[PDB]
Amino acid sequence: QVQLQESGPGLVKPSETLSLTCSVSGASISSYYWIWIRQPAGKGLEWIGRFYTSGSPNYNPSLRSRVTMSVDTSKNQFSLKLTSVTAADTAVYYCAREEHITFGGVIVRYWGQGTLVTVSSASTKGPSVFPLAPSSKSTSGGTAALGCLVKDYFPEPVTVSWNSGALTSGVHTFPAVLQSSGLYSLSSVVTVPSSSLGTQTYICNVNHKPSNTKVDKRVEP
Amino acid sequence: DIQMTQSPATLSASVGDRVSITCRASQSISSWLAWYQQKPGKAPKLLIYKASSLESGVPSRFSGSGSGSEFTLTISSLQPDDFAIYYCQQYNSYPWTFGQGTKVEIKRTVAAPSVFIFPPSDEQLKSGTASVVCLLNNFYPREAKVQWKVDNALQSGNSQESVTEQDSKDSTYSLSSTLTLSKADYEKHKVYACEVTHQGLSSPVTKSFNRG
Amino acid sequence: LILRDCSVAGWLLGNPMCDEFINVPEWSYIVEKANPVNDLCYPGDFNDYEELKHLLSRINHFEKIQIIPKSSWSSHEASLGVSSACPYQGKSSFFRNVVWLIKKNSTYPTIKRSYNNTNQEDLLVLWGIHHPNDAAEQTKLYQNPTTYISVGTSTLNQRLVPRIATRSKVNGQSGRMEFFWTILKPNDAINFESNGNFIAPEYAYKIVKKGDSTIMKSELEYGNCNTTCQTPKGAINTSLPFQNIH
Amino acid sequence: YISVGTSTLNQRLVPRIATRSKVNGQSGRMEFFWTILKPNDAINFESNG
Numbered sequence: 052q053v054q055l056q057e058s059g060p061g062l063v064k065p066s067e068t069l070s071l072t073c074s075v076s077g078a079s080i081s082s083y084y085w086i087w088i089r090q091p092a093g094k095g096l097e098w099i100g101r102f103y104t105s106g107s108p109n110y111n112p113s114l115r116s117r118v119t120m121s122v123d124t125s126k127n128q129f130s131l132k133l134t135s136v137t138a139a140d141t142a143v144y145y146c147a148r149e150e151h152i153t154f155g156g157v158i159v160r161y162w163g164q165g166t167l168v169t170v171s172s173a174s175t176k177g178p179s180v181f182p183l184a185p186s187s188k189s190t191s192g193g194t195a196a197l198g199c200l201v202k203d204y205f206p207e208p209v210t211v212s213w214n215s216g217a218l219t220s221g222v223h224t225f226p227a228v229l230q231s232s233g234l235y236s237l238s239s240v241v242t243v244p245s246s247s248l249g250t251q252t253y254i255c256n257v258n259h260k261p262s263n264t265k266v267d268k269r270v271e272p
Numbered sequence: 273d274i275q276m277t278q279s280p281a282t283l284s285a286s287v288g289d290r291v292s293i294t295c296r297a298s299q300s301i302s303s304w305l306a307w308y309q310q311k312p313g314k315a316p317k318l319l320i321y322k323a324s325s326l327e328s329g330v331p332s333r334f335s336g337s338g339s340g341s342e343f344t345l346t347i348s349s350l351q352p353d354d355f356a357i358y359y360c361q362q363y364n365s366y367p368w369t370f371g372q373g374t375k376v377e378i379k380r381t382v383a384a385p386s387v388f389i390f391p392p393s394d395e396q397l398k399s400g401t402a403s404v405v406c407l408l409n410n411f412y413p414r415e416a417k418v419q420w421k422v423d424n425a426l427q428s429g430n431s432q433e434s435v436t437e438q439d440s441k442d443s444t445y446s447l448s449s450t451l452t453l454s455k456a457d458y459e460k461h462k463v464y465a466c467e468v469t470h471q472g473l474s475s476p477v478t479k480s481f482n483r484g
Numbered sequence: 485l486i487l488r489d490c491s492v493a494g495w496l497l498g499n500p501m502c503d504e505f506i507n508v509p510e511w512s513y514i515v516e517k518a519n520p521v522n523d524l525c526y527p528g529d530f531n532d533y534e535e536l537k538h539l540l541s542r543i544n545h546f547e548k549i550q551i552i553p554k555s556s557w558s559s560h561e562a563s564l565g566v567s568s569a570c571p572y573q574g575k576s577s578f579f580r581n582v583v584w585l586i587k588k589n590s591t592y593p594t595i596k597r598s599y600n601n602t603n604q605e606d607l608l609v610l611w612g613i614h615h616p617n618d619a620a621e622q623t624k625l626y627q628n629p630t631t632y633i634s635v636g637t638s639t640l641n642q643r644l645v646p647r648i649a650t651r652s653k654v655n656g657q658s659g660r661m662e663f664f665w666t667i668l669k670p671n672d673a674i675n676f677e678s679n680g681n682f683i684a685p686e687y688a689y690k691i692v693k694k695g696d697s698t699i700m701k702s703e704l705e706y707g708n709c710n711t712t713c714q715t716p717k718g719a720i721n722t723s724l725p726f727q728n729i730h
Numbered sequence: 731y732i733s734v735g736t737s738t739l740n741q742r743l744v745p746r747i748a749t750r751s752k753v754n755g756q757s758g759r760m761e762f763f764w765t766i767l768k769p770n771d772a773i774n775f776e777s778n779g
């Protein structure tokens with residue numbers, strides 16, 4: 052049961068540096084190699100580098116000049132530092148565990164979740180959550196839809212969960228749309244039995260990590 | 273240093289078909305290739321190592337073959353949860369490299385959407401803007417057209433659509449068409465309507481609300 | 485009577501699970517198990533639960549009146565408040581005997597409905613109180629806050645007030661529901677007057693037979709023969725004067 | 731009025747205004763109540779006076 056999780060600012064002024072920290076639970080960072088990998092937009096994966104507390108590291112030659120990777124045995128922290136970030140360096144970043152040798156060689160079974168680093172001079176702006184009430188009047192057979200619109204947010208990473216993880220079936224959390232303002236807007240929708248509208252309530256937990264906003268809003272007819 | 277070229281970077285097959293994805297290499301990798309399944313918005317999940325060794329917990333239907341310069345990932349009975357981008361990797365020599373990935377999608381029975389309209393939120397209205405939303409839910413032919421009629425006045429501008437990726441269970445899609453207007457907020461107009469046009473519908477389905 | 489994995493409370497309150505016990509046979513020596521799987525689905529407790537159990541020791545058969553008002557009554561409330569808990573074979577449902585009363589058009593007018601069986605047998609009327617987690621929740625179900633529930637019978641009159649407070653999540657719901665019961669005599673009446681938070685009943689039980697029974701708890705399952713002796717451990721055959729079995 | 735609101739016990743109490751015998755120079759009395767609050771259990775006090 053090894054767990055990897057990344058922490059990242061979301062925004063890095065261009066021509067400056069990128070600092071990322073992958074915290075590891077369930078393994079001593081002293082006794083494993085660790086990997087940083089990059090994924091811009093929907094494009095392919097790019098392996099950034101490898102490091103080991105007691106072993107010389109190897110970094111991808113495209114990024115070598117800018118990459119430095121360190122380890123903090125006290126807090127089990129795997130670090131990534133990208134000097135002189137360009138616009139191209141805007142990407143999702145993943146940390147992973149380089150397993151010990153097997154008769155299958157070096158394998159990576161354990162991955163992080165990924166943090167999206169955008170590279171902009173723009174300013175962190177928090178979302179605005181507004182409900183999408185159900186038109187109970189609509190016959191719509193026996194089904195009815197609920198929503199939580201999330202508008203005017205500038206760091207793209209935005210997470211939406213319904214009823215604190217209790218609602219998972221029927222949820223369609225749409226992809227971001229970049230508006231003319233330069234700000235993003237998500238819609239999250241849930242199809243529901245029309246019957247359960249009266250007795251059960253419906254809530255949205257929306258957590259814009261870069262702005263540290265966590266607006267939870269109710270959807271009442 | 274060593275490139276990894278995959279094929280075809282776009283597939284589509286109904287459930288049960290065999291699928292096979294080829295991955296070629298600038299140099300010989302002997303058997304140091306690995307295959308990954310990246311689902312929508314998730315980390316890659318390692319499918320195959322040593323170019324043939326299935327990792328534990330991967331279904332019997334995945335199978336990797338090849339040595340040297342050409343390699344093949346094969347799915348025996350493509351299932352709905354297999355919708356994903358599939359990648360390929362050299363752990364032969366550094367720097368490590370990946371393929372461009374191939375997106376395996378799923379052909380399905382045609383599904384008619386279910387349409388919903390959402391009027392703008394009063395709180396937003398107080399802020400000084402307004403948004404109406406058409407929700408098209410669970411349709412297979414991703415291709416559909418949604419029109420915005422404002423008292424029978426089509427208005428292409430002030431509208432943005434976004435699409436879900438394929439569901440793992442249904443392999444269906446959903447659309448959100450967001451009409452964003454605030455000229456007199458949405459005053460000067462009594463009715464709003466979505467004209468939704470799709471193959472699963474004999475004649476276009478409009479839905480409409482006249483609140484404001 | 486076999487109760488498989490249903491509590492007595494569930495069998496009497498009509499829990500969607502084990503609704504296989506609605507056509508009660510005319511005979512009943514309680515075979516209940518300790519900690520049944522399907523009990524009071526929607527988190528709650530039964531007032532004077534063991535007293536009811538003791539009366540059941542005498543009772544041997546029941547008859548659902550199916551006359552207590554009805555779900556059709558929809559004058560002031562909505563008869564459509566099924567819960568995401570109490571799943572019927574995996575389908576969200578609620579106790580059939582009691583009813584999830586809920587405000588109608590953003591308005592929950594106090595209902596002074598009342599019933600007197602005038603039948604020849606006694607009654608086992610059942611009702612409940614919903615203790616919500618938020619006042620907002622209370623308003624969503626009953627726009628009236630700080631509600632009251634008045635039970636007016638010939639012998640017992642108790643006014644009850646719901647305790648609005650978030651508790652632990654059970655079956656996805658931290659709200660609780662108290663279940664009350666009373667024995668309505670033939671020609672005895674019961675008046676219900678509720679501000680809000682009322683779970684009125686729709687069925688009750690006519691005491692068909694009050695013979696001799698017990699609530700022996702036995703994790704054993706039925707096995708088909710028939711003696712003049714029964715114990716939660718088993719059934720005796722020879723007839724000596726004393727017993728060290730149970 | 732004095733309202734004690736816990737997860738298990740809710741009791742509303744009203745003071746009995748009445749002169750009694752003088753004890754320690756005071757005929758007023760004070761009732762003392764107690765409850766066991768579980769970890770993660772709450773107690774709401776609402777008092778008129």
Ligand SMILES: *[C@@H]1O[C@H](CO)[C@@H](O[C@H]2O[C@H](CO)[C@@H](O[C@@H]3O[C@H](CO)[C@@H](O)[C@H](O)[C@@H]3O)[C@H](O)[C@H]2NC(C)=O)[C@H](O)[C@H]1NC(C)=O
Nearest residue numbers: 598599600601602603604637638669670671672673674675
């Ligand atoms: C329905 O509930 C009544 C509520 O108390 C309950 O009380 C009844 O008590 C007896 C039982 O029927 C009735 O006495 C009546 O006497 C007249 C003689 O003038 C007869 O003609 C009549 O048939 C009846 O026996 C009470 O009048 C009645 N109380 C009421 C209605 O105020 C009863 O169980 C039941 N009501 C009736 C009429 O059966």
Ligand SMILES: *[C@@H]1O[C@H](CO)[C@@H](O[C@H]2O[C@H](CO)[C@@H](O[C@@H]3O[C@H](CO)[C@@H](O)[C@H](O)[C@@H]3O)[C@H](O)[C@H]2NC(C)=O)[C@H](O)[C@H]1NC(C)=O
Nearest residue numbers: 215216256617649650651652653737768769770771772773
């Ligand atoms: C202070 O008093 C609360 C009053 O009931 C009491 O209830 C709490 O119950 C648990 C215990 O912490 C909380 O559950 C939470 O679950 C979220 C997951 O989304 C966690 O992030 C969070 O840390 C917590 O474990 C309830 O939320 C909470 N009830 C409330 C506050 O309504 C608790 O004893 C205590 N509150 C907390 C937050 O500890």
